[PDB]
């Protein structure tokens, strides 16, 4: 998609192998915020979103949280607290065309700045001047979208780049996307090092009487330490008792 009208695709209900992208060494950038690359395979997410678009090379630097510029403000804005990875690569031999690829559009004119993650695909003529445009181009009346006109002979700052912004919902809510991990069996009344959908700690798993309502996944303490979980494979609730300790 054109950056002014970027696409979004939802990722859910899967095993997400992120090593395929990370270790490909085929990207100009792979910058993660809130998570480190390679740790992604040990995480679970509720939903994962992949936003995609084409921008010119000098603009790759605008796809960042807290960043400003013509794309950051009129085409694709990321929030200051964004968690995710911005992955991009050069497409000079794919999207650039001889004579110019004018299919990709960006917004140059807008009345105000965009909110994080929204879209504006209006074609309303921009009222640059004082005399109402009434939908028609003319002096101080502009069509809001511009083409890139990408050519194979352009320098890098003007070569097209394909950008995928991968957004991670690291929420308390049940995961639908988990990395390529293998499971083990449950035990009861023993001290174990556990991992339930990315939730980790050390403790003793026992049968719980804390009936969880159908939408609840774990119980929580005063100190934010969890104290019960719904097992990811079998619908039973386990209590987590800390392993015994004391002064000596």
């Amino acid at each position, epitope marked *: 998609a054109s950056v002014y009208a970027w696409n979004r695709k939802r990722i859910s209900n899967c095993v997400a192998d992120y090593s*395929v992208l990370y270790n*490909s*060494a*085929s*990207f*100009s950038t792979f910058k993660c915020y809130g998570v480190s690359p390679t740790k992604l395979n040990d995480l679970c997410f509720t939903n994962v979103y992949a936003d995609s678009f084409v921008i010119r090379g000098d603009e790759v630097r605008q796809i960042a949280p807290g960043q400003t510029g013509k794309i950051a403000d009129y085409n694709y804005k990321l929030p200051d607290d964004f968690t995710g990875c911005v992955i991009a*690569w050069n497409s000079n*031999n794919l999207d650039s065309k001889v004579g110019g690829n004018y299919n990709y559009l960006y917004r140059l004119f807008r009345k105000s700045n965009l909110k994080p993650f929204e879209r504006d695909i209006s074609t309303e003529i921009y009222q640059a001047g004082s005399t109402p445009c009434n939908g028609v181009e003319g002096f101080n009346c502009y069509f809001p979208l511009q083409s890139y006109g990408f050519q194979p002979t352009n320098g890098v700052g003007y070569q097209p780049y*394909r950008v995928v912004v991968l957004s991670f919902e690291l929420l308390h809510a049940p995961a639908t996307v988990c990395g390529p991990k293998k499971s083990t069996n449950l035990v009861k009344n023993k001290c174990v090092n556990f991992n339930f959908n990315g939730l980790t700690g050390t403790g003793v798993l026992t049968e719980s009487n804390k009936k969880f309502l159908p939408f609840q996944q774990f119980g929580r303490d005063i100190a934010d330490t969890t104290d019960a979980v719904r097992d990811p494979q079998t619908l039973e609730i386990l209590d987590i008792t800390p392993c015994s300790f004391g002064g000596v």
Partner: nanobody
Amino acid sequence: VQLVESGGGLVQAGGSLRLSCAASGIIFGRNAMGWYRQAPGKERELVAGITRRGSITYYADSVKGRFTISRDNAKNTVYLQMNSLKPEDTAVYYCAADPASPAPGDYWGQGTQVTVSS
């Protein structure tokens, strides 16, 4: 970064056809190089390959008796010779390193079309 191909064209099944390609040192210096092919109805596969050192060759079994792979380290080129081409060999042939990434950023050249008629 730069991969070019030639030696394609339309032939009748049988006869012979020689493909050729060249690459910048960035790819040519890789441990091994070979030829890949694609066609409507089928995905990309490695047909044959030759190493940089020792001129060690290997072929997919399905092509082993009719395809020959070779390289020239003075010229920075790789070749694939087909002897008695079959209609099933119609494909676009590409030059690339034997290991390759599925990522969109792993550079491929345009490829050259080989067409084989009845």
